[PDB]
Point group: C2
Chain length 604, copies 2
């Protein structure tokens, strides 16, 4: 009895390979999910955590009706809850059961039930596991309801499309009726999938959801969404606040068509769903409305003699697909010129709902790292105050990398507290310019304000060793290169400053030409009554090829050494110290604690 | 292109057939693939590239062109791991191990886990799967961080996985950039070997003449530069430089390391054999350990250890 069931589970085991085939699936796991399915219910989605015996790790088992994409939503629930799964198996079985819920026969007459089992590695948190076990039934029921209402939503789309192509009822006040209809039939041709459908009647700025027209997920979701159509718009794209647990990626998109059957009555057809992949890379021309505003702005493009057609055309084709609807060719002119003006370009657009900020970034290919993704995610979540951020990574041979960020906003926020002004737009845009900056380029940029020779700048751009790069800042490079250029053969320069803490000082020692050991320089410095705490060395080659050494000193004076009554006193003490230490290096005095008097009595 | 669109949608069918495999994903994966070779492929030989997705290491494919003036090279590696840098070293390792007179690439990256680049190497053809897998690893390590390479080196070590995981991120970034992934094994073993306020010294000879590298492990408390060198100066060797580091152990104990580039006084005798250098280093370690612990006094009498070979 046990053996037949274990066969069909493995027949669909796919990689997240087929090795240790009996080790993943034991007859104990078979016992568990047969114990679960022992007494089910129609439409039920029975979920159960088999904790694992001596051999196999934790493993979950489900018994529900064969509905579309249960497996996909399963794995999405996994990854969105950080649940490391080793395998996954979906043998659906033709089952005929009794009238009180009991299975009578299970074969691959009756009804089709999917029986699922996934072995979780041992490394799994009990609570995330339990959380997902709870989530299972509701989202599998979402899947079932859509698998049922699929043809229904198909036909609702077809019908509203025929209405728009033949709007003789005056119900759709817009010229793009026919293009709207063509685009609806284009999405219907394997370019968009329907989760739910709900009509909505608009009045007094309030949208009331018509409940009978509800199909798919919106049948189980009490999520009235606000009026999504201004008066003019026949068509608006919003993004749903809710995670369709039904596939990876962006949160669902809500298409809305505005109909007007009376002079005091608006009805919003709302289709929630998501974008197919082949769609999301369709040539931007194949879309009806898109080709329209495209050539619209193309006119203005070929008008200005400078601005070249296919140049900015390229500039556009990249621009990802979701946001393509909120832009009018007027807003196309800005997008094109925004991109036409080795720098970071950032675009923002408050969603009609204002629960998402569609953010889009531009930067050299050779410059992107997952790191820079993070700091930009941070700088985007921060400067926008996000409660969640997603990204879609897009990189080709193209010079500039492209990523759309969607920033999730804490529900209860308005389309007004969205400072999407082009003021705030360009400011953060630079927070990404520097995020992309190496330290060498930032150095060079800092010296752009310097009056130093370009040749010296180019030599020190790569002359600086990598430890200096990682133990400094791009801004310190200007001062360091000036002092290095300032050196002579076997010269010495000393610069004393106070570090960030109390009674601790930072002393930088430039040796101009020859390195010096740690063993001879400190008895010099010790004879100044200050305790030397630490040193960090560096070496490099100058613009003239002269090797120069640098010693950074974290020091602290003896407690008996007096403090500085003002920054003026500290400045004089440091200058006298520099003269004295320079004299010590050059052999002008002898090394004993008499030198300490410089630090005590303020003497040269 | 007429024929191209044909086999394209041909394989697109099989593509949208497998529910996992996404259309425009692999579509992107394709559009890069340069143009000349597009004709020799049948959609079967497409699906071959397609079902090559159905499979954290680098995968490299080679195929001598019928002409043998180009080597069509194709590489596979995690998305989060690619940099233009790695592009270059692979370009170098490709031009080198293949002897190229010119190399091109087409960059292809999506949400897909593995990045994809076709390299075409220009020739002025050992395409055997022998030589194929060898260079394939020269990209394995090219992709390797230093933390992962460290951990991989200790994979041969017998150390505890918990300690391995803690020191994987416990190692500070200056240590990452001032060391090698292989030195991590020895360093972590010596760190784990420490006690409270302990000291261990390891002396070796650097790459040059009459210059030695001395690593000083302080087990528990940091120490200033100002007190340790008079100890070492009393050994007749001139200390040339030091480089410090600090870190937190598997048990949370902070340990300090001081690297010393040193050289002896010219009057100090050389080593007649590696055996003599080993004995001198061991006696030195005992003597310096005693100096740290306060067992002797600091004067140039200690120099006799380096001159007469005494303990």
């Amino acid at each position: 009895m046990i053996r037949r069931l274990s066969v069909a589970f493995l027949s669909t085991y796919r990689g997240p390979a087929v090795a240790a085939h009996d080790d993943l699936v034991s007859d104990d796991l078979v016992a568990a999910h047969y114990r679960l399915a022992s007494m089910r219910a129609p439409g039920e989605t029975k979920a159960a955590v088999y904790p694992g015996d001596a051999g196999s790790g934790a493993a979950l088992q489900i018994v529900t009706d064969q509905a579309p994409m249960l497996v996909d939503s399963v794995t999405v629930l996994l990854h969105r809850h950080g649940i490391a799964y080793t395998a996954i198996m979906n043998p659906v079985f033709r089952v005929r059961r009794g009238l009180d819920g009991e299975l009578l026969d299970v074969r691959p007459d009756g009804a089709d039930e999917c029986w699922i089992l996934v072995p979780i590695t041992a490394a799994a948190d009990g609570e995330a596991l339990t959380e997902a076990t709870r989530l299972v039934p509701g989202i599998l029921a979402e899947a079932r309801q859509i698998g049922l209402d699929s043809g229904a939503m198909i036909a609702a789309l077809h019908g509203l499309a025929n209405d728009l192509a033949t709007d003789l009822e005056g119900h759709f006040p817009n010229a793009e009726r026919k293009e709207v209809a063509a685009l609806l039939r284009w999405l219907a041709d394997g370019h968009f999938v329907l989760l739910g459908y709900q009509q909505c009647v608009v009045g007094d700025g309030n949208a009331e959801v018509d409940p009978a027209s509800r199909l798919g997920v919106l049948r189980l979701r009490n999520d009235v969404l606000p009026p999504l159509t201004d008066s003019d718009d026949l068509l608006v794209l919003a993004q749903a606040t809710m995670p369709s647990y039904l596939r990876y990626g962006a949160y669902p998109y809500i298409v809305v068509v505005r109909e007007s059957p009376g002079a005091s009555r608006v009805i919003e057809h709302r289709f929630v769903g998501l974008f197919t992949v082949a769609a999301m890379n369709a040539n931007a021309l194949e879309i009806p409305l898109i080709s329209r505003r495209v050539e619209e702005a193309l006119a203005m493009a070929h008008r200005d003699p400078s601005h070249p057609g296919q140049l900015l055309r390229d500039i556009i084709q990249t621009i990802p697909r979701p946001e393509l609807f909120a832009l009018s060719s007027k807003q196309l002119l800005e997008m094109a010129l925004a991109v036409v003006d080795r720098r970071t370009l950032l675009f923002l657009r408050a969603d009609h709902l204002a629960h998402f900020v569609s953010c889009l970034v531009y930067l050299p290919r050779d410059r992107y790292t997952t790191a820079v993704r993070l700091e930009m995610q941070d700088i985007l979540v921060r400067e926008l105050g996000g409660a969640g951020i997603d990204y879609s990574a897009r990189v080709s041979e193209s010079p500039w990398a492209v990523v759309h960020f969607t920033v999730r906003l804490p529900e209860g926020t308005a389309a007004d507290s969205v400072d999407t002004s082009l003021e705030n737009e360009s400011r953060i845009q630079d927070l990404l310019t520097e995020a992309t900056r190496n330290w060498g380029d930032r150095m060079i940029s800092a010296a752009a304000a310097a009056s130093i020779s370009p040749a010296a700048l180019e030599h020190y751009a790569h002359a600086f060793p990598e430890d200096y790069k990682q133990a400094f800042a791009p801004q310190d490079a200007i001062a360091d290169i000036s002092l290095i250029e300032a050196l002579q053969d076997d010269s010495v320069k000393l610069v004393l400053a106070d570090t960030a803490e109390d009674r601790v000082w930072k002393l930088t020692w430039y040796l101009g030409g020859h390195s010096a050991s740690l063993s001879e320089l400190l008895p010099m410095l010790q004879s100044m009554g200050v305790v030397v705490l630490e040193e960090r060395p560096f070496t490099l080659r100058r613009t003239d090829g002269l090797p120069v050494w640098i010693y950074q000193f974290k020091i602290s004076p003896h407690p008996s050494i007096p403090h500085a009554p003002d920054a003026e006193a500290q400045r004089d003490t440091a200058q006298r110290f520099a003269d004295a230490v320079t004299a010590i290096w050059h052999g002008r005095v002898e090394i004993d604690r008499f030198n300490e008097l410089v630090m005590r009595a303020g003497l040269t």
